[PDB]
Amino acid sequence: MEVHAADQYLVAPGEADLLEVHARLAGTGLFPPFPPVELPGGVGGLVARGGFAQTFFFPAEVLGLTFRTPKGRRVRAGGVVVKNVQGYDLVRLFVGSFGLLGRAEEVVLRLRPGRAQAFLRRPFSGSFPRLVPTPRFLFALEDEEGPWLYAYHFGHPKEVERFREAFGGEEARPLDLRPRFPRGLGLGEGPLWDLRFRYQDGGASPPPPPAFLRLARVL
Amino acid sequence: MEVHAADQYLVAPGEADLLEVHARLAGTGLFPPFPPVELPGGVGGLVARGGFAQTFFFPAEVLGLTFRTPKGRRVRAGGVVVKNVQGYDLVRLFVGSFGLLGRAEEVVLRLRPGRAQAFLRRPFSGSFPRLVPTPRFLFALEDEEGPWLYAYHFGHPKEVERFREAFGGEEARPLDLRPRFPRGLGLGEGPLWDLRFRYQDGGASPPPPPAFLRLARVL
Secondary structure (H helix, E strand, C coil), X not given: CEEECCCCEEEEECCCCHHHHHHHCCCCCEECCCCCEECCCHHHHHHHHCCCCECCCHHHHEEEEEEECCCCCEEEEECCCCCCCCCCCHHHHHCCCCCCCCEEEEEEEEXXXXXXXXXXXXXXXXXXXXXXXXXXXXXXXXXXXXXXXXXXXXXXXXXXXXXXXXXXXXXXXXXXXXXXXXXXXXXXXXXXXXXXXXXXXXXXXXXXXXXXHHHHHHC | XXXXXXCCEEEEXXXXXXXXXXXXXXXXXXXXXXXXXXXXXXXXXXXXXXXXXXXXXXXXHEEEEEEXXXXXXXXXXXXXXXXXXXXXXXXXXXXCCCCXXXXXXXXXXXXXXXXXXXXXXXXXXXXXXXXXXCCCEEEEEECCCCEEEEEEEEECHHHHHHHHHXXXXXXCCCEECHHHCCCCXXXXXXXXXXXXXXEEECCECCCCCHHHHHHHCCC
16 A cells, blocks of 8 residues: 555555554554454445544545446546546545445545544443544444443544543554454444444445436446 | 524525525524525536535535436435435535536535624735635636635634634625626636636536446436
């Protein structure tokens, strides 16, 4: 993969692992649009699902991508160094398409700056709290010891310190949840959930609207 | 149109004029995702072009929309909570499609709160400046006198005040540019331009990528 530190963006293969990306950004002061949590599908799958644990609008963090349609056609979308007169949003079309349009072979993601970072966890209480400052990522996970509210944030040491003081809990190390979703990260009443979905091992993919089913046949 | 003040969103027919939306919201403390400038096509046209004068990601400000395809079908997309399981972004697909996918019959836009606003202009220097704080909208327009840099911002009274301080210039009133673009707001070497396009009366529409031409045939 390619880390464009100065321009704050990353170029990586769809098959790149989420922790693989975090490992590569170690000490760079740059952060990807996802927490230190490994999930089935890697970067490509994450993009296809429209992100994980975000408290922000994820699609805008995807600057470009190249995907392979279920028919074998290569489609390039967006870009950084080269781009057409814009419009015709092929990037957002793919983001959140859950694999219906094929798999991402390459993804270009925006990276955000941060002098400090904190990945914390604390006992869950039913609903997601409104923290201040709002962490960039928030999600719940049941560890069999009860639910756990996880939060990941980065930015100025002052905002992060502020985050720690508002959240409390304990420091958490990078998680690898692939072992708990062997049949795939689908949707359902599973042990993991964020502001958008509740995930379940082998759960079904969300139902696409008629229009999407139609366009997917000709892409 | 229907103003859902408490939920901070607006439902408007595609033909609603940009200035009628502003008049409808004047005094509500809520602002639409466009400045006080009338442009050919109304809100539907604005959405089709992917926004006007924004310094932010415009597509995210569009929560839903209903369009009639060239073949006659009508497809309802998005809809803040309750549409489908957040995925398959038909909304962003339409935003910035320039009419290629059909006409917007209805648009659902997010409204942003603000206790103060400022619409100002100053002689354009030849390139867009990096302002601090950065205004929500910025564009350049030529008049008999010459090119003018226009900026529109809203939000916290102290934020807007600081903007007025850094930007300088003079107070500007709502503009109606339909008379200057009677043949439509297309692309070209015209008298109006923002961070994404340079507009021209009766100008051409941007060229769609192959993938877009393909799915346009269906849906």
